[PDB]
Write a protein that binds this ligand. Sequence first.
Ligand SMILES: *[C@@H]1O[C@H](CO)[C@@H](O[C@@H]2O[C@H](CO)[C@@H](O[C@@H]3O[C@H](CO[C@H]4O[C@H](CO)[C@@H](O)[C@H](O)[C@@H]4O)[C@@H](O)[C@H](O[C@H]4O[C@H](CO)[C@@H](O)[C@H](O)[C@@H]4O)[C@@H]3O)[C@H](O)[C@H]2NC(C)=O)[C@H](O)[C@H]1NC(C)=O
Ligand SMILES: *[C@@H]1O[C@H](CO)[C@@H](O[C@@H]2O[C@H](CO)[C@@H](O)[C@H](O)[C@H]2NC(C)=O)[C@H](O)[C@H]1NC(C)=O
Ligand SMILES: *[C@@H]1O[C@H](CO)[C@@H](O[C@@H]2O[C@H](CO)[C@@H](O)[C@H](O)[C@H]2NC(C)=O)[C@H](O)[C@H]1NC(C)=O
Ligand SMILES: *[C@@H]1O[C@H](CO)[C@@H](O)[C@H](O)[C@H]1NC(C)=O
Lengths: 372, 101, 51
Amino acid sequence: THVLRFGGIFEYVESGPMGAEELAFRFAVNTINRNRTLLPNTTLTYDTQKINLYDSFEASKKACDQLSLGVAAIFGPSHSSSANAVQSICNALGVPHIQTRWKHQVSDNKDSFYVSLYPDFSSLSRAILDLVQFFKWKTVTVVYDDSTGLIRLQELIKAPSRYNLRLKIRQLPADTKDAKPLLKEMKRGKEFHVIFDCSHEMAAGILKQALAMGMMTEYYHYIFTTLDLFALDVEPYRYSGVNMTGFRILNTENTQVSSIIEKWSMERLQAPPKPDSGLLDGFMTTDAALMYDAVHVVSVAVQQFPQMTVSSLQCNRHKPWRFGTRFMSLIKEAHWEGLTGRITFNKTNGLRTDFDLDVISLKEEGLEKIGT
Amino acid sequence: GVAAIFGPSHSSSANAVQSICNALGVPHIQTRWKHQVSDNKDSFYVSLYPDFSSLSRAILDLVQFFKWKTVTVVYDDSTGLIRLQELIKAPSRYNLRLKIR
Amino acid sequence: QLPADTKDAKPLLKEMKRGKEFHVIFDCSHEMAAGILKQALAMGMMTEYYH
Ligand SMILES: *[C@@H]1O[C@H](CO)[C@@H](O[C@@H]2O[C@H](CO)[C@@H](O[C@@H]3O[C@H](CO[C@H]4O[C@H](CO)[C@@H](O)[C@H](O)[C@@H]4O)[C@@H](O)[C@H](O[C@H]4O[C@H](CO)[C@@H](O)[C@H](O)[C@@H]4O)[C@@H]3O)[C@H](O)[C@H]2NC(C)=O)[C@H](O)[C@H]1NC(C)=O
Ligand SMILES: *[C@@H]1O[C@H](CO)[C@@H](O[C@@H]2O[C@H](CO)[C@@H](O)[C@H](O)[C@H]2NC(C)=O)[C@H](O)[C@H]1NC(C)=O
Ligand SMILES: *[C@@H]1O[C@H](CO)[C@@H](O[C@@H]2O[C@H](CO)[C@@H](O)[C@H](O)[C@H]2NC(C)=O)[C@H](O)[C@H]1NC(C)=O
Ligand SMILES: *[C@@H]1O[C@H](CO)[C@@H](O)[C@H](O)[C@H]1NC(C)=O
């Protein structure tokens, strides 16, 4: 009648409540319900459960609990261990499974009811590979942190088979934040061009230890992979003369979009985020930005189909959801220029391989856009 | 009611049944290599297939007894690049020139 | 000469970095020597080329 119900599975915080991706999902449902102009007949409710992100069975419990309670979509357990579990819950039951962060798609996965609003690393990799040729390099050094990130950079590893690069691949130590044994080698090894593959939490920690090593002269050039380089405290580095270069998807250029981020920080007012870390405060990460888009993309789909009755499904009984294929194809065919530019999926797999990045770089006047 | 589960033998479903066996306590004896995620906090699993952290140095020893200076690693699926970590990272410490296809 | 009023000697050190001067014989008190040595780090003028 006037109610639809989205699911939700998030990490269980203990110290400091309501973590980062949970706020993005709550702020999105409240926004669409408030601004009545979009979707003007039904009100969205939510059933966010909280698990550990490294338990593929605690995820499978809370997935069937939301299926028994009755939902219309599950917005991702957001980690490669339990994402593959809840995806195959949603395939047998028929319910869509909107992911929000990249995982390893196995090449023979025969599932269909999933979309991935995080940009594919089959397209980010060629965006980096284009950017190591506009700068005309012949010797790079890919540094990653966990072993899954080597699958993230396939097209950059396979690149010296067709171009003139000379790859040298290193790995950060897994346990500590002390990568000074690594950087002493790279300073001595004459490697001035680095393509770091880290999260922005670990990218700030290397960028402080690359300053204490004196490896931040005007001879170096760091390309970061993460789409959160705009949220770095780059003020200790802006005068030195380095050229950090990264991509950026979250459109700050639009006034209608940057109004949301200004309205984001007022609920983020209760956050002293320990400013001795290296992260700017009051900025919304790109992982929370995609969850705010993922609610609106499905909200476009329910607008184009008012015949949804949220039924309750059993797991132990095997029966697909009767509005499955009708509602899933509307999600794969959608457009919504929300926070992160154009959201349009790919009809073959269901991923996102068509997006609009902004190449950002470091200058003395801050961290500025130099291309698209 | 069993005492052990002898592996679903593939990287998609091995990670599922491993985390079934961790919460239930039952051992999970694997029999073929998968991608161990570096932050997996499970304990009830053994892997009788030899690790590719040790096969990789066995290959890297064998490309030096033959005294090579130019190799060409060819793999088939993308998981196999994680299989050969220590051979890709090798020209940072030796005199090889890797070309990966 | 350092500016007399401020502790901001970044207009000075931008010239010395650009002027290729790698050898400096600073005459300061240790209160002001610590303040220049922090601003010589934010300018990136503390590589292994300087003395
Ligand atoms: C849905 O998703 C699928 C993925 O499965 C998309 O398919 C991919 O589409 C991209 C489009 O960019 C294809 O990219 C193309 O591949 C080239 C690779 O070079 C090969 O071929 C040349 C010449 O034959 C050889 O020399 C070489 O050795 C390789 O064998 C790339 O060079 C091109 O992409 C990029 O080119 C340059 C990079 O330097 C830049 O201009 C751009 O970054 C450009 O993107 C070329 O476009 C890719 O092969 C497809 N298949 C995959 C990944 O398996 C679908 O397109 C998508 N559907 C949509 C969007 O509707
Ligand atoms: C509430 O929704 C309405 C209807 O969309 C918004 O009005 C326009 O929204 C579109 C995109 O949704 C913008 O491109 C237009 O610029 C908006 N028109 C204006 C600003 O006159 C409205 O902006 C939404 N409310 C808020 C607070 O953003
Ligand atoms: C790498 O470093 C500099 C330092 O940020 C980049 O910026 C230029 O800095 C010089 C200082 O001598 C200014 O005169 C230029 O105007 C700056 N560039 C622009 C576009 O404003 C510089 O762009 C980078 N150079 C290379 C070759 O990568
Ligand atoms: C649904 O919303 C539209 C808005 O244009 C309205 O015209 C229509 O009457 C609504 N349907 C109802 C209230 O059943």
